[PDB]
Coordinates of C-alpha atoms and ligand atoms in Angstrom, one line a residue:
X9 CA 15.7 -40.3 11.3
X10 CA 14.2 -37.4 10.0
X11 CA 12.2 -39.6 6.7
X12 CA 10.2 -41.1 8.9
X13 CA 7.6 -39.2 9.6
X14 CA 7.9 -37.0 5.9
X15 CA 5.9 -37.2 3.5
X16 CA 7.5 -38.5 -0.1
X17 CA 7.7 -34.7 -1.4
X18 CA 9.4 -33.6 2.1
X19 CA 12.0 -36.6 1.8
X20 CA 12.8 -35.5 -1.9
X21 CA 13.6 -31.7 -0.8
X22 CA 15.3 -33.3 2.6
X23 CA 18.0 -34.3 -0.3
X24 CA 18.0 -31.0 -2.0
X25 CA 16.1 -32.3 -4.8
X26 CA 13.7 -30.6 -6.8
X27 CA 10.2 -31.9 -5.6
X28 CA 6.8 -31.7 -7.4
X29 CA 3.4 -33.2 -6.9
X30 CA 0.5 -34.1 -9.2
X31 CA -3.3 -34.7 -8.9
X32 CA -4.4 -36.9 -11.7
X33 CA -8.4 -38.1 -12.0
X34 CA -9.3 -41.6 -13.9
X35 CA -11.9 -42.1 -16.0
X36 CA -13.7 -43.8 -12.7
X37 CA -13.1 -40.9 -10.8
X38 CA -9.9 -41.5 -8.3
X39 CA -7.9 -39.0 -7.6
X40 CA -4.1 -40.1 -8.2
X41 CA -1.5 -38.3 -6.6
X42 CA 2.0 -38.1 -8.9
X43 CA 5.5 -37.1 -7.7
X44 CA 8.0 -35.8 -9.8
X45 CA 11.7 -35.2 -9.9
X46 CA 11.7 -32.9 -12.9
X47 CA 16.2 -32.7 -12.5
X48 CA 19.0 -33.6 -10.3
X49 CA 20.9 -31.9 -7.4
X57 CA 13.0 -31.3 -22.0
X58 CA 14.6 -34.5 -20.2
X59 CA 13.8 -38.5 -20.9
X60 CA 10.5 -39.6 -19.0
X61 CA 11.2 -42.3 -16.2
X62 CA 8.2 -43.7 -14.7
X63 CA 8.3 -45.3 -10.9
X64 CA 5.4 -47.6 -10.0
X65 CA 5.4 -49.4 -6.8
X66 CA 4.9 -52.8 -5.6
X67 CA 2.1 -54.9 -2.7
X68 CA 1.1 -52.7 -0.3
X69 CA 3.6 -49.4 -1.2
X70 CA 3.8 -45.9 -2.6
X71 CA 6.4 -43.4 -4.0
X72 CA 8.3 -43.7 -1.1
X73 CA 10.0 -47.2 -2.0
X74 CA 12.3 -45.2 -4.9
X75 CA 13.5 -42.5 -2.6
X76 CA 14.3 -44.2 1.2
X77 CA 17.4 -45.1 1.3
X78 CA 20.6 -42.2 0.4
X79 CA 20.5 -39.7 -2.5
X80 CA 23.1 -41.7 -3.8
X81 CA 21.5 -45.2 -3.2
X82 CA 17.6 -44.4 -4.1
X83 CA 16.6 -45.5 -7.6
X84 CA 14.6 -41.9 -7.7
X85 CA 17.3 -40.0 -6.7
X86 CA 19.8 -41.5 -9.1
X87 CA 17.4 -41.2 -12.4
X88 CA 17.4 -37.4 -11.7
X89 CA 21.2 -37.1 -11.4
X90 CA 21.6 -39.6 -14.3
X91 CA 19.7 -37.1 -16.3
X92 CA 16.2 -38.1 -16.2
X93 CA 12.9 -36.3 -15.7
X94 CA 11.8 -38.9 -12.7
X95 CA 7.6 -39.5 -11.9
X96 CA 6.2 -41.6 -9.1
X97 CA 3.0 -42.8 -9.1
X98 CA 1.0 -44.1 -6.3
X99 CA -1.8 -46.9 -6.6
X100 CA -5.6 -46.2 -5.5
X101 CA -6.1 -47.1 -2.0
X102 CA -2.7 -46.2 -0.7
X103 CA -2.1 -43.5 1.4
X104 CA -1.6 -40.8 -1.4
X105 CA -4.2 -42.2 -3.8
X106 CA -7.5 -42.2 -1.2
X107 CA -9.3 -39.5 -2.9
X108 CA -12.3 -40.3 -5.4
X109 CA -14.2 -37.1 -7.4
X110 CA -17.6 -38.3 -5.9
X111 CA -16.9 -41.5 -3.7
X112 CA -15.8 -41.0 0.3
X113 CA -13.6 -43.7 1.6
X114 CA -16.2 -44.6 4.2
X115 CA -18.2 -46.8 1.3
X116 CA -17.6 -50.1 0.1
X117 CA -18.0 -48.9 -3.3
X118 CA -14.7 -46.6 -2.9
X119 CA -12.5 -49.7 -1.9
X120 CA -14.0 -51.8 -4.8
X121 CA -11.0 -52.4 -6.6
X122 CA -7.8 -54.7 -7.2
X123 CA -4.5 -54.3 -9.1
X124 CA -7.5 -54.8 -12.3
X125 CA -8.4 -51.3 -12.2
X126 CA -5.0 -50.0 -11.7
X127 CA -3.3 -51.6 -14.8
X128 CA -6.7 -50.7 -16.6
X129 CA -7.0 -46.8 -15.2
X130 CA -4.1 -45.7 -13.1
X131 CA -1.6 -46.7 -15.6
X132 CA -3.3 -45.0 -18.2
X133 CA -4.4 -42.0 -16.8
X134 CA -1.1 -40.9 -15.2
X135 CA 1.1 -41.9 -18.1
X136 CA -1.4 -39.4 -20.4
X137 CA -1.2 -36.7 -17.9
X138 CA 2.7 -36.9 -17.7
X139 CA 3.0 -37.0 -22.0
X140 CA 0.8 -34.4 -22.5
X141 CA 2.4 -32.6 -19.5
X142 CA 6.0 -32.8 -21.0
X143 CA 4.8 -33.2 -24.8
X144 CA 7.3 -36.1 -24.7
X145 CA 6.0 -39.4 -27.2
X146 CA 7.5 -42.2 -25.3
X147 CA 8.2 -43.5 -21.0
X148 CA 10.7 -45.6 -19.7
X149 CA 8.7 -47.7 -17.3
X150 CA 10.3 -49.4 -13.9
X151 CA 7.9 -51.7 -11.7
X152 CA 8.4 -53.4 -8.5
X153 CA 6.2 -56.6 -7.5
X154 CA 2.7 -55.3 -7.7
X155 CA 3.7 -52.7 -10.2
X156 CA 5.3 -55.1 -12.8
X157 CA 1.7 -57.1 -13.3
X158 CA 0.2 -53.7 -13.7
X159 CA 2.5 -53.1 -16.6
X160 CA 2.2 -57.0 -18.0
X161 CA -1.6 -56.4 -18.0
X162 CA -1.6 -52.9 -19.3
X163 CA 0.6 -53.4 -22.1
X164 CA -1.0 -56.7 -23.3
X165 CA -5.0 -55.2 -23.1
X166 CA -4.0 -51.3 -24.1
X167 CA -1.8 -51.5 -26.9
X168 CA -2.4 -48.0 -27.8
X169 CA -0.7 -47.5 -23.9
X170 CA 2.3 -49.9 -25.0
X171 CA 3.3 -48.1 -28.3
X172 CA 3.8 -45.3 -25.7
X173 CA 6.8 -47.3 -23.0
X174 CA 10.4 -47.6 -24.4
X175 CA 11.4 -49.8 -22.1
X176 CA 9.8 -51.9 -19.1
X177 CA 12.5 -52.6 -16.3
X178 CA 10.5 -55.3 -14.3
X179 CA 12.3 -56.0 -11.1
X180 CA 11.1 -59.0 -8.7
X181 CA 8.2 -59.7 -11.4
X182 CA 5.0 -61.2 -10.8
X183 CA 2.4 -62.5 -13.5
X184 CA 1.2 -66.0 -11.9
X185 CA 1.7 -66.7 -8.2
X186 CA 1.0 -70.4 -8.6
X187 CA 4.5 -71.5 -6.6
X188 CA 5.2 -68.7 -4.0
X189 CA 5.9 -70.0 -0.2
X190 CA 5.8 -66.2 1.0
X191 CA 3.4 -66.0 4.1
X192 CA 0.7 -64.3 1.2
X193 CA 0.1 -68.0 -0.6
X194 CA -1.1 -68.7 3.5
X195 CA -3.2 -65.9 3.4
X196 CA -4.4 -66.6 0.1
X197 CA -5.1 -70.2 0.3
X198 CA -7.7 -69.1 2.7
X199 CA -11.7 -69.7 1.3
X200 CA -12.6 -65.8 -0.3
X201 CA -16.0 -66.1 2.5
X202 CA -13.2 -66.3 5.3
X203 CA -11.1 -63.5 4.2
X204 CA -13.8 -61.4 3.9
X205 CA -15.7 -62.3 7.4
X206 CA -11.8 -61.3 9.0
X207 CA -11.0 -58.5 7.5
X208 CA -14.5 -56.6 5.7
X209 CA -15.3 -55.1 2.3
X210 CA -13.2 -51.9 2.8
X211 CA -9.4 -51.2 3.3
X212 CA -7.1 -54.1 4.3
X213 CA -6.1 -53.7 8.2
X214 CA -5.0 -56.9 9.7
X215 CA -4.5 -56.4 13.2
X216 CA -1.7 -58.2 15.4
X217 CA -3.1 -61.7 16.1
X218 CA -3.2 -62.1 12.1
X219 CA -0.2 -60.7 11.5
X220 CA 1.0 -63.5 14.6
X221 CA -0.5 -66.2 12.7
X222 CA 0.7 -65.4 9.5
X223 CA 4.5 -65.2 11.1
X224 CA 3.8 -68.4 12.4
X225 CA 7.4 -70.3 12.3
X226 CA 8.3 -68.7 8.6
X227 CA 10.1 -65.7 10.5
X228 CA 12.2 -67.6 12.9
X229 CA 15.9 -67.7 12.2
X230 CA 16.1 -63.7 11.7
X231 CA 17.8 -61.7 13.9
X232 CA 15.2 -58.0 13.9
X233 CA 12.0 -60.3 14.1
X234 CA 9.8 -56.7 14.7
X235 CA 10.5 -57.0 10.9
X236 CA 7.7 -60.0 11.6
X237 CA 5.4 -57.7 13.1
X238 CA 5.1 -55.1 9.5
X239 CA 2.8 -56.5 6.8
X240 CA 5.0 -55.8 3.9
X241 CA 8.2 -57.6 5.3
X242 CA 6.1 -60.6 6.3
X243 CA 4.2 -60.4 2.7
X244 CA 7.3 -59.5 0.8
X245 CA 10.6 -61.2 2.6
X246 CA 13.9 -59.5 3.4
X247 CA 17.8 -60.5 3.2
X248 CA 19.5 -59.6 6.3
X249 CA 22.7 -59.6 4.7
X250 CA 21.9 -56.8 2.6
X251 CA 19.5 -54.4 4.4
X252 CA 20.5 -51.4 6.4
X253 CA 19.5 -52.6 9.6
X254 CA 20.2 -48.9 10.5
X255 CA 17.2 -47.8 8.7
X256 CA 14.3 -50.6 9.5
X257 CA 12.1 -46.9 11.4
X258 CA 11.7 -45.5 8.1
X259 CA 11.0 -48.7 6.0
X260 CA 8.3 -49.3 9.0
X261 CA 7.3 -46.1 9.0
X262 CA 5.9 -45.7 5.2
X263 CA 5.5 -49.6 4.6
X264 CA 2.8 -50.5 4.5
X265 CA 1.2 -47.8 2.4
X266 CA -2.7 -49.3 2.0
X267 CA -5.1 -51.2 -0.2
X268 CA -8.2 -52.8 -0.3
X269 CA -9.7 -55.9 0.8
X270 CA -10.5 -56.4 -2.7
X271 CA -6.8 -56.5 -3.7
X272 CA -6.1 -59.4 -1.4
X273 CA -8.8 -61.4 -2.5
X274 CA -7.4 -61.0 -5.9
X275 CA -3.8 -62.0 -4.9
X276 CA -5.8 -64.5 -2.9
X277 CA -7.8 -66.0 -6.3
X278 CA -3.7 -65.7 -8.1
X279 CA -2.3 -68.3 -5.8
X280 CA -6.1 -70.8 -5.2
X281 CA -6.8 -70.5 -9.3
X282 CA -2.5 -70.4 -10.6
X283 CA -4.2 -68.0 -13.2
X284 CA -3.2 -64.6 -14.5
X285 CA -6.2 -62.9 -15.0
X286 CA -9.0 -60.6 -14.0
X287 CA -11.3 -61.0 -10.6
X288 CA -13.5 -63.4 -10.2
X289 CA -16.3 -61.7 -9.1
X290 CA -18.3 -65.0 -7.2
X291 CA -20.9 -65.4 -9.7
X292 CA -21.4 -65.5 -13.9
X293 CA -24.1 -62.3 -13.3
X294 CA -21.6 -60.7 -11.3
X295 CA -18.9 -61.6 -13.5
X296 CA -21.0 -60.4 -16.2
X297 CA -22.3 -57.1 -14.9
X298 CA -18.6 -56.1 -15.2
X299 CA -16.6 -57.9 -17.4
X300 CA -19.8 -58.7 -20.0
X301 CA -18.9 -62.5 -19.8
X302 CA -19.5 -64.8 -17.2
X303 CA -15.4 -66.0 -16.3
X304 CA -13.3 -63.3 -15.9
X305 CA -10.9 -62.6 -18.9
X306 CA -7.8 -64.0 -18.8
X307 CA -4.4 -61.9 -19.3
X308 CA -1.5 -62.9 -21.8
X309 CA 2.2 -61.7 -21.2
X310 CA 2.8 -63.3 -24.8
X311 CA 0.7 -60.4 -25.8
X312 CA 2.8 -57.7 -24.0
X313 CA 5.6 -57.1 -27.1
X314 CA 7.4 -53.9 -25.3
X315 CA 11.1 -54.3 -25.0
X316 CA 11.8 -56.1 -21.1
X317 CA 15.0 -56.4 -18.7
X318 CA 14.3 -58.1 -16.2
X319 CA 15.9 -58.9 -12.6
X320 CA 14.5 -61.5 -10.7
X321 CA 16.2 -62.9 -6.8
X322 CA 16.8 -66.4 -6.0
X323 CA 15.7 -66.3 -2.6
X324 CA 13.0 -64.1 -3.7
X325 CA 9.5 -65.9 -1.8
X326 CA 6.9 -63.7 -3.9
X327 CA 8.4 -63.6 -7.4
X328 CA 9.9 -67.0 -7.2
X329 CA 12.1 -69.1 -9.7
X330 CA 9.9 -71.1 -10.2
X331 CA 6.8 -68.7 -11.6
X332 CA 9.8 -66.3 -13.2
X333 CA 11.2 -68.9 -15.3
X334 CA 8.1 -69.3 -16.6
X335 CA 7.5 -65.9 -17.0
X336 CA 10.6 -65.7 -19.4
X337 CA 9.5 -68.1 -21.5
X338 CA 6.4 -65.9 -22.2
X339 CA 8.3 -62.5 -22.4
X340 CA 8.4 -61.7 -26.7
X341 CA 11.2 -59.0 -26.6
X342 CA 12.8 -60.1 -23.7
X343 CA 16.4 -57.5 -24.0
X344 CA 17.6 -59.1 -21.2
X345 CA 17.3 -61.0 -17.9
X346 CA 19.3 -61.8 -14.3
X347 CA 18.7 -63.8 -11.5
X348 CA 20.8 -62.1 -8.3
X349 CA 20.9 -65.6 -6.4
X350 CA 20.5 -64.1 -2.4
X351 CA 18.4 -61.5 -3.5
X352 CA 15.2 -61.4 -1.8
X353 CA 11.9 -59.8 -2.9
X354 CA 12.8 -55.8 -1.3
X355 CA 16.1 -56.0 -2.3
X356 CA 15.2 -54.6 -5.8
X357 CA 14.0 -51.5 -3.4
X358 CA 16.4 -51.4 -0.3
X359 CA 19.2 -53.6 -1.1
X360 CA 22.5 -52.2 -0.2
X361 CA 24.0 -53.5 -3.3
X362 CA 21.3 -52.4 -5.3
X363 CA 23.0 -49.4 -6.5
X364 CA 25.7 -51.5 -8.1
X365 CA 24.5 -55.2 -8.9
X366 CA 20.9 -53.5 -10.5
X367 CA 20.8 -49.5 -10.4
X368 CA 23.9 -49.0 -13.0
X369 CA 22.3 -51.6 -15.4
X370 CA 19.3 -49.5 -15.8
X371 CA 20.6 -46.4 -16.8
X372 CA 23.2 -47.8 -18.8
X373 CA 20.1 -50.0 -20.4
X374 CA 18.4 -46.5 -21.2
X375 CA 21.8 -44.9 -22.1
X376 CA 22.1 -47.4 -25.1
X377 CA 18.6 -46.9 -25.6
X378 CA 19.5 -43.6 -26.3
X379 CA 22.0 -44.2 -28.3
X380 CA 19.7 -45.7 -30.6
X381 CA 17.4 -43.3 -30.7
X382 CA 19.6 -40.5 -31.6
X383 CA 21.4 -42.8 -34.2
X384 CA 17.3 -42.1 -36.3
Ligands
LIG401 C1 22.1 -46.6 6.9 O1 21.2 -46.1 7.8 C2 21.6 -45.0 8.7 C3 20.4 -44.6 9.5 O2 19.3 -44.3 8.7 C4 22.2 -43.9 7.8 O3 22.7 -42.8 8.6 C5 22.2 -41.5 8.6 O4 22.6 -40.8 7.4 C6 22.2 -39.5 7.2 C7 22.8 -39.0 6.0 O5 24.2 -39.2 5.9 C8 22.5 -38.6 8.5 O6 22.0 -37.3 8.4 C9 22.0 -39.3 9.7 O7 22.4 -38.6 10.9 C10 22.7 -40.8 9.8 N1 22.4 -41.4 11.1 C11 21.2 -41.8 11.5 C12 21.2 -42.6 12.8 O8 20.1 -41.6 10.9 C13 23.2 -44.4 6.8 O9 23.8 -43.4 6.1 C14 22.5 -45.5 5.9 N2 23.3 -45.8 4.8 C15 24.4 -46.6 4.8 C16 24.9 -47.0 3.4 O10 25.0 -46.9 5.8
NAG402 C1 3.5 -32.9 1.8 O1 4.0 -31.9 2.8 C2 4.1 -30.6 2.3 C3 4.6 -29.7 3.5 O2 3.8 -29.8 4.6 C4 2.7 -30.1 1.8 O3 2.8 -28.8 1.2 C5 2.2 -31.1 0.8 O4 0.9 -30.7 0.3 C6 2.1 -32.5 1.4 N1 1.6 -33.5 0.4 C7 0.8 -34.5 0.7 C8 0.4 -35.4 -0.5 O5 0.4 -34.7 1.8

């Protein structure tokens, strides 16, 4: 398969699609890289954050005619990518070298609080366009809950939030992350260091530990973000498992996992705890670390959740619901598992048609005032 080894711009002109990259900088100096798929094979703004562990890639892996990416830009959409700090496009900091601890100092905190932000702003002032339609997978859905319920002045700017496999609390997940996290923070730290999270494959062994034994790949076992994330055999293209390997996972920090870690140990949403009220308080100017409210978060939300989904559970969804003001609608896809909402093979019908249809009567709204 020729996407394997391609970068995310080289898949998007492998499809004869028009491809364009970005360099945005954050108020703390990272250097975000954006892609963009300004048309199809001044135009609505579609924004595509990723989930745990991923980049840009996720929305444009599978066919031009089954890729959530790909079928914004056909449907009419002016599509942008962004790519957390950390990951394989995002490792550049204005001062910072990825060799210091100081550069990997971050969790999904800073990338609700800065990314978000910072590449929305570049993207309106870029098109002069008021408003974003935003879609989040996993990790990129609590980026959205957070930045939309502490920067209202960001929400006011999002039309729409499409949260698909969403993730606020993590309090009942039985994905092999609540093992991970349910380790002491000392422990993870002493495996693993204060820099970029690289488990190697004894950890990744342990972690698999009878949880990924009535599959039929198994190597599946061996990549972090299938083990982390889950996957429905019944609906993957077992086909195309090299390029899923290949670009998954896409890199973060140590940091991040000890945040995911304090998620699932605390069953709180809110910001890191840093180990101690003066640490706590040299960055949050309080000794506990604030605590986030989706009953805050008043943008209009469809969401999609899966039944079999080990991450974004029913459990933690339902209650996520409850909490959603403006909640425009909501379905549970009962074998769906967490990268379905990515690389399901029914994607494109069960989810992918619901979205732009969502956006299409959006629309209609709009240009009815
Ligand atoms: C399932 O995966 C296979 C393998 O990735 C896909 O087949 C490739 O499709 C492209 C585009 O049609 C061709 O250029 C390749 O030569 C095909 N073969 C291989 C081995 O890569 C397949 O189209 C995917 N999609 C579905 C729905 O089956
Ligand atoms: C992607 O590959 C193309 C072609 O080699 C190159 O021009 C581009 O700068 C690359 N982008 C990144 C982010 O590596």
């Amino acid at each position: 398969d020729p996407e394997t080894n391609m970068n995310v711009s080289e898949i998007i002109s492998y499809w004869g699609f028009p491809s364009e990259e970005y360099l945005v900088e954050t108020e703390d100096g990272y250097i975000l890289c954006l892609n963009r798929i300004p048309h199809g094979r001044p135009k609505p703004v579609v924004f595509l954050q990723h989930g745990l562990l991923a980049d840009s890639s996720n929305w444009v892996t599978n066919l031009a005619q089954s890729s959530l990416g790909f079928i914004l830009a056909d449907a009419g959409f002016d599509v942008w990518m962004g790519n957390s700090r950390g990951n394989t496009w995002s490792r550049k900091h204005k001062t910072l070298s990825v060799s210091q601890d100081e550069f990997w100092a971050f969790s999904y905190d800073e990338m609700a609080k800065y990314d978000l932000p910072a590449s929305i702003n570049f993207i309106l002032n870029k098109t002069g366009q008021e408003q974003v339609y935003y879609v989040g997978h996993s990790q990129g859905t609590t980026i959205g809950f957070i930045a939309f319920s502490q920067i209202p002045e960001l929400a006011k700017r999002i039309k729409m939030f499409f949260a698909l496999g969403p993730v606020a609390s993590v309090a009942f997940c039985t994905s092999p992350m609540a093992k991970l996290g349910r380790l002491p923070d000392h422990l993870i730290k002493d495996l693993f260091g204060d820099k970029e999270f690289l488990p190697q494959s004894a950890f990744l062994k342990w972690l698999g530990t009878h949880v990924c034994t009535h599959v039929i790949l198994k190597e599946l076992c061996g990549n972090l973000c299938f083990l982390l994330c889950g996957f429905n055999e019944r609906n993957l293209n077992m086909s195309r498992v090299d390029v899923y390997t290949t670009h998954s996972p896409a890199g973060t920090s140590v940091q991040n996992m000890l945040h995911w870690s304090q998620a699932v140990k605390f069953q709180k949403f809110q910001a890191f705890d840093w180990g101690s009220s003066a640490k706590n308080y040299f960055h949050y100017q309080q000794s506990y670390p604030p605590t986030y409210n989706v009953k805050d978060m008043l943008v209009p939300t469809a969401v999609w959740s899966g039944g079999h989904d080990w991450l974004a559970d029913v459990y933690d969804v339902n209650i996520l619901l409850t909490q959603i003001t403006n909640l425009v609608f909501h379905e549970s896809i009962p074998e769906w598992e967490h990268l379905d909402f990515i690389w399901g093979l029914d994607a494109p019908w069960r989810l992918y048609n619901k979205i732009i249809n969502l956006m299409r009567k959006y629309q209609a709204s709009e240009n009815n005032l």
